[PDB]
Amino acid sequence: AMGEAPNQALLRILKETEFKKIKVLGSGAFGTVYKGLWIPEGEKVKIPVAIKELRTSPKANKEILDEAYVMASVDNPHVCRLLGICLTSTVQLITQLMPFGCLLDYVREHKDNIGSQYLLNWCVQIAKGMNYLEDRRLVHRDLAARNVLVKTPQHVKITDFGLAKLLGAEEKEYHAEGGKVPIKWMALESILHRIYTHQSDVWSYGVTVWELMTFGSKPYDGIPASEISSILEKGERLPQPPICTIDVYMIMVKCWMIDADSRPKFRELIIEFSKMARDPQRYLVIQGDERMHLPSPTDSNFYRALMDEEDMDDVVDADEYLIP
Ligand SMILES: COc1c(Cl)cccc1Nc1c(-c2ccncc2OC[C@@H]2COCCO2)[nH]c2c1C(=O)NCC2
Numbered sequence: 001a002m003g004e005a006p007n008q009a010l011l012r013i014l015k016e017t018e019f020k021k022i023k024v025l026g027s028g029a030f031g032t033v034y035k036g037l038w039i040p041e042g043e044k045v046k047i048p049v050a051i052k053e054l055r056t057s058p059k060a061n062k063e064i065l066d067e068a069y070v071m072a073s074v075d076n077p078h079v080c081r082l083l084g085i086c087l088t089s090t091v092q093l094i095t096q097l098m099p100f101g102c103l104l105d106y107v108r109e110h111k112d113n114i115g116s117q118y119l120l121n122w123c124v125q126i127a128k129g130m131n132y133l134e135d136r137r138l139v140h141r142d143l144a145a146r147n148v149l150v151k152t153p154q155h156v157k158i159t160d161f162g163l164a165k166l167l168g169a170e171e172k173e174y175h176a177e178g179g180k181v182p183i184k185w186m187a188l189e190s191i192l193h194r195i196y197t198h199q200s201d202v203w204s205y206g207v208t209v210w211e212l213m214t215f216g217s218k219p220y221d222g223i224p225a226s227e228i229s230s231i232l233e234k235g236e237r238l239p240q241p242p243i244c245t246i247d248v249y250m251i252m253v254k255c256w257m258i259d260a261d262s263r264p265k266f267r268e269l270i271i272e273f274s275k276m277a278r279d280p281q282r283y284l285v286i287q288g289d290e291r292m293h294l295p296s297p298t299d300s301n302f303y304r305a306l307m308d309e310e311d312m313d314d315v316v317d318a319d320e321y322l323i324p
Pocket residue numbers: 025026027030033049050051052071080081082083093094095096097098099101102146147149159160161
């Protein structure tokens with residue numbers, strides 16, 4: 001290979017007839033996500049899935065297959081895995097159902113029952129996912145709490161590869177065209193010069209941490225997008241959240257430095273958040289932190305809750321259903 005290494009990822013084409021109990025989960029800019037059961041015939045397994053459609057265009061099929069290509073390649077516990085595609089008039093993406101929804105909605109809904117240990121563990125897991133993306137030379141370009149999903153309260157994964165770009169071995173930067181991007185998660189060099197790197201992803205990581213530590217506050221709330229570059233050029237940044245020690249806030253501020261190379265590396269963020277996760281109340285101050293429980297797999301109706309009784313026996317999490 002005179003350039004980069006062959007991508008020998010398998011693309012699995014899933015039969016429409018293998019999918020049952022399709023219900024809408026959510027719709028927005030990402031399109032529409034459904035939940036269902038994937039039943040690979042003659043296997044005696046029922047795999048909870050999400051199914052994503054785009055907003056039958058040739059332009060739509062192109063963009064959904066670009067996301068399929070990116071995801072087919074990624075194998076990490078903190079990144080959404082493509083199970084396959086379904087070739088309906090509109091092409092569909094199939095992934096493991098993340099039953100607790102996106103982490104932004106989760107921290108808003110459960111903001112009175114979320115302790116320091118969950119918040120720091122999520123920061124570690126997101127940094128692990130992002131570090132893996134960097135090892136694969138992938139720039140996500142859309143990291144935000146809305147693009148983190150909750151398998152269980154203890155286990156989150158990065159999703160939405162709609163803006164993701166692969167760098168060649170030679171290459172340091174993605175140079176974008178005129179396409180629309182979430183400005184309030186973007187590094188200043190991305191806003192000003194359409195430059196995207198692993199280090200512009202670290203800026204987005206900082207904003208994502210700020211979203212978690214504020215239990216889902218909107219960054220620069222009620223500031224027009226068009227005013228954001230100016231605010232950042234003046235040296236202004238998101239304020240210290242009430243629960244954050246200077247230790248935690250300083251990591252966020254380092255993610256928002258002007259010199260991209262001065263920002264932390266995801267592998268450094270894994271180390272720092274993991275040390276903090278060993279003594280979480282030294283790093284986040286949450287009223288009532290001590291007495292807080294969220295659902296874990298060792299709960300009465302944990303599995304009963306989000307499934308039908310007739311499916312209970314043969315249900316298999318996609319994480320335990322391995323490339324046959
Ligand atoms: C790219 O990966 C996926 C593939 Cl290949 C196939 C289907 C879905 C996805 N991923 C996504 C989910 C999602 C994933 C798993 N289980 C539940 C999910 O959705 C819960 C709620 C619904 O309501 C919206 C918020 O999330 N959700 C979202 C995306 C996503 O790309 N953009 C933002 C919203």
